[PDB]
Structure formats: structure tokens, C-alpha cells
Amino acid sequence: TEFPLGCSPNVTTPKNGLSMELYSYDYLKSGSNPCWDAAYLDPNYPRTGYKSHRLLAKVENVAGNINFYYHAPMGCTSLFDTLPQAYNYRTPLTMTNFTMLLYGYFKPKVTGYHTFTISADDLLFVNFGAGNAFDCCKRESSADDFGNYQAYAVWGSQTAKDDLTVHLDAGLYYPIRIFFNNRDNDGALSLTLKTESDPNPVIDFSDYFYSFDDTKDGCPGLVSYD
Ligand SMILES: CC(=O)N[C@@H]1[C@@H](O[C@@H]2O[C@H](CO)[C@H](O)[C@H](O)[C@H]2O)[C@H](O)[C@@H](CO)O[C@H]1O
Ligand SMILES: [Ca+2]
């Protein structure tokens, strides 16, 4: 979808950053082959399956540069380390093996074409736009109903890097959902943004990520171009 639907929350001062949920991604029993759990590849793991793992935390105000590379000292071993500052989560977690969901709204600074580019170890699935990610100011009631991924990247496959080129309006806030998994060993997440305006990729999303409370009537976007 080249013209994704946006939202018009018309809230006085919007809340900065996305919401995050972290969940466990345990290795298989210590004599299993391979050592890692393959659930991350089942089609419903990003929808229902992650909820069968342990909730590690629900965090708010995730904003900044969310990109990271984590080098595991060794493979098939659950090891602890920390996420970047932007994630608002300071305590060590199993960086070798975990699940992470981010959701909220993306607001453009300038109207025009935006190319989001992603790469991941092991997995990054992105939904973007109302309906596709979730409904405007109706996130809780549409949370699990996200459609086809607007970008997807899986380590070791024939689509390990992906992009999404969309025409966006600076007036609107766009529902976004980002689902990440590290099954084992190294972990990495790269999201960048390229517009027809700037000369280089944007990697710091501080002024771009927002959160909005759900409302009874919702907040459909009030910019349309048919
Ligand atoms: C198969 C491979 O390339 N590497 C194995 C290690 O695990 C993978 O490492 C990659 C990065 O190279 C990804 O992070 C992937 O998610 C991992 O599963 C594995 O842990 C060890 C064996 O102990 O070495 C490689 O076999
Ligand atoms: Ca990995």
C-alpha cells in the first residue's frame, strides 16, 4: 500500500515514543537439535504465540535510535546484556534470545515519499498504516488483527533486508507495529528512514514516534487525496 491511512488524534500534547513489550524466547532443552526454538517462524507467533512466553516488561516512551547490533560471546547459550538507551529498559536481559514488540504511531516531519528500510537478526516484521497495523485510536480492540507485513526481514532467508516506500503526510499519525525476535546468538535490529528531502538516512526517531490513548469513536485521518 503506497498510500497508507493515517490518523488525526487531535490531542493537545501527544505522548512521546512507542510502547514496548518484551517476552522470553527460551532455548530448547539443552540436548535439542537445533538448540533454538523454531516458534518464531510460525505464522501466528507474532500474533498469538508470543503471549505463551513469559512477559518480561511493558515499557512506554521508546524513542531515539532503536538500532543495535549484539554480538554473542558464544552460540546456543543464553547470555545477558542490555538494550540501547532509547528502549527505556536498563536491566540485563537475554540478548541472545528474546522477543520484542513495539507499537504506536509514526508522524512525518515533511509530506512526501518515505522509504523505511529494515534488517534483522533474527526477525523483524513491520505493519504500517491504519487497518494494517491497527485502527486509529482503537489499538486495543484491533491489536491482534494486523494484516500483511509491509516489510519483513528474516536472518538467513532470501529476504533478510526489506523496505517500504510510502507517501506520507506530515499532518497525520501513522499506526506502526514492529515485531522482533532473536532466536539465538547474535541479535540485530536496523530501522532507517530515507525521504526525498534529506541527503542521508534518518536513524534517530525521537521526534517521529508517538503514543495515543484509544477513544470510543476513534480518530480516522482527516487528510485524504483520492
Ligand atoms: C548457522 C550460523 O551461521 N551460525 C550458528 C550460530 O547461531 C546463529 O548465528 C547467526 C549469526 O551468524 C544468527 O544470529 C542466528 O540467529 C543464530 O542461530 C550458532 O549459535 C553457533 C553454534 O553453536 O554457531 C553457528 O552454527
Ligand atoms: Ca540470532
Side-chain angles (χ1 to χ4, degrees), residues 1-28 30-226:
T1 321
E2 197 176 315
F3 283 86
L5 304 170
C7 310
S8 300
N10 278 336
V11 166
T12 181
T13 304
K15 311 192 216 307
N16 295 280
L18 305 173
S19 309
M20 162 173 71
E21 310 189 349
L22 288 158
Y23 297 79
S24 72
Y25 197 81
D26 296 334
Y27 280 93
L28 301 174
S30 212
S32 282
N33 198 24
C35 64
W36 40 270
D37 183 5
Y40 79 110
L41 297 164
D42 319 307
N44 253 20
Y45 182 76
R47 194 183 304 280
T48 72
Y50 70 89
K51 295 181 190 175
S52 70
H53 293 202
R54 294 180 307 283
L55 175 65
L56 305 179
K58 295 186 176 174
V59 171
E60 301 305 325
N61 311 117
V62 177
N65 189 325
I66 68 174
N67 301 347
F68 66 89
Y69 171 62
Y70 168 75
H71 185 248
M74 74 207 88
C76 292
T77 313
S78 194
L79 293 166
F80 287 73
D81 212 309
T82 56
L83 286 155
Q85 154 181 80
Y87 287 94
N88 251 296
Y89 188 88
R90 279 171 149 196
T91 42
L93 74 151
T94 46
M95 285 295 294
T96 46
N97 58 298
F98 75 106
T99 299
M100 183 174 63
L101 164 65
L102 307 165
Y103 65 85
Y105 297 77
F106 175 88
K107 194 205 170 280
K109 275 178 192 199
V110 188
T111 291
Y113 280 97
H114 290 62
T115 296
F116 297 95
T117 305
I118 62 162
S119 186
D121 176 350
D122 280 281
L123 180 142
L124 196 60
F125 288 160
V126 178
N127 290 107
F128 192 95
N132 184 268
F134 53 89
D135 300 347
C136 296
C137 298
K138 245 89 105 76
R139 200 271 311 170
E140 208 197 41
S141 71
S142 61
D144 302 334
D145 296 322
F146 55 86
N148 295 336
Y149 301 128
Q150 295 308 302
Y152 49 96
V154 184
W155 183 89
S157 77
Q158 292 170 8
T159 187
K161 181 279 291 167
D162 213 23
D163 58 30
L164 170 65
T165 293
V166 287
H167 189 274
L168 303 181
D169 211 278
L172 301 176
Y173 291 84
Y174 292 90
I176 186 168
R177 181 181 195 276
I178 295 156
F179 190 87
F180 168 83
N181 204 83
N182 189 12
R183 83 195 185 176
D184 169 48
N185 202 42
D186 290 4
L189 188 160
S190 164
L191 175 68
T192 76
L193 164 70
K194 174 51 189 167
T195 64
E196 295 188 29
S197 312
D198 277 347
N200 291 291
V202 177
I203 62 178
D204 186 339
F205 293 101
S206 294
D207 302 324
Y208 292 94
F209 292 165
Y210 297 95
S211 295
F212 292 102
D213 294 343
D214 295 331
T215 58
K216 203 186 169 291
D217 299 337
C219 60
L222 303 173
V223 176
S224 188
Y225 292 125
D226 80 312

XYZ file of all heavy atoms in Angstrom, residues 5 22 43 53 64 67 69 75 77 85 97 121 145 162 171:
113
model
N -3.240 4.668 5.273
C -4.154 5.549 6.000
C -3.509 6.021 7.297
O -2.867 5.243 7.999
C -5.468 4.830 6.323
C -6.283 4.208 5.188
C -7.405 3.350 5.766
C -6.848 5.270 4.266
N 8.397 -6.723 26.073
C 9.418 -7.758 25.957
C 8.876 -9.091 26.470
O 8.164 -9.111 27.462
C 10.648 -7.379 26.773
C 11.474 -6.239 26.200
C 12.303 -5.611 27.318
C 12.353 -6.726 25.054
N 3.626 -18.768 11.461
C 2.911 -17.554 11.043
C 2.198 -16.796 12.181
O 2.105 -15.569 12.121
C 1.883 -18.076 10.030
C 2.469 -19.332 9.499
C 3.293 -19.927 10.614
N 4.779 -17.144 25.962
C 6.065 -16.954 26.638
C 5.893 -16.042 27.848
O 4.808 -15.533 28.083
C 7.087 -16.385 25.656
C 7.444 -17.340 24.566
N 8.613 -17.249 23.843
C 6.797 -18.434 24.101
C 8.655 -18.226 22.957
N 7.571 -18.967 23.101
N 14.105 7.378 19.997
C 15.510 7.624 19.752
C 15.961 6.696 18.650
O 15.156 6.267 17.817
N 18.276 1.153 16.872
C 19.114 0.199 16.169
C 20.194 -0.349 17.074
O 20.742 0.366 17.911
C 19.740 0.847 14.933
C 18.691 1.358 13.965
O 17.510 1.027 14.092
N 19.110 2.169 12.999
N 23.392 -3.712 17.254
C 23.995 -4.979 16.957
C 24.496 -5.576 18.266
O 25.258 -4.941 19.006
C 25.153 -4.822 15.972
C 25.926 -6.099 15.836
C 25.315 -7.240 15.342
C 27.251 -6.186 16.250
C 26.005 -8.434 15.239
C 27.956 -7.373 16.145
C 27.326 -8.492 15.634
O 28.007 -9.684 15.525
N 27.478 -19.132 20.864
C 26.177 -19.569 20.363
C 25.530 -20.602 21.259
O 26.186 -21.170 22.127
N 23.745 -20.402 23.776
C 23.938 -20.062 25.179
C 23.155 -18.798 25.469
O 23.298 -17.800 24.760
C 25.423 -19.804 25.514
O 26.230 -20.848 24.969
C 25.640 -19.738 27.033
N 19.846 2.738 25.135
C 19.135 3.706 25.984
C 17.711 4.024 25.519
O 16.797 4.128 26.343
C 19.953 5.006 26.059
C 19.154 6.271 26.352
C 20.027 7.513 26.385
O 20.392 8.068 25.335
N 20.359 7.967 27.595
N 18.511 -14.293 23.112
C 17.254 -14.975 22.816
C 16.066 -14.314 23.483
O 15.799 -14.520 24.666
C 17.341 -16.453 23.195
C 17.685 -16.662 24.654
O 18.753 -16.254 25.118
N 16.768 -17.294 25.394
N 18.465 -9.653 12.782
C 18.882 -10.984 13.194
C 18.181 -11.176 14.525
O 18.587 -10.561 15.496
C 20.409 -11.063 13.322
C 20.903 -12.421 13.849
O 20.087 -13.254 14.305
O 22.126 -12.665 13.817
N -5.226 -7.941 15.058
C -5.882 -8.073 13.752
C -5.074 -7.458 12.612
O -5.619 -7.184 11.539
C -7.272 -7.435 13.804
C -8.209 -8.146 14.774
O -8.159 -9.387 14.849
O -9.004 -7.459 15.452
N 14.619 -5.612 3.835
C 13.412 -5.217 3.133
C 13.197 -3.723 3.267
O 13.808 -3.058 4.108
C 12.214 -5.978 3.708
C 11.146 -6.287 2.676
O 11.452 -6.328 1.464
O 9.984 -6.501 3.084
N 0.774 15.927 8.392
C -0.393 16.160 9.234
C -0.892 14.953 10.021
O -1.609 15.110 11.011
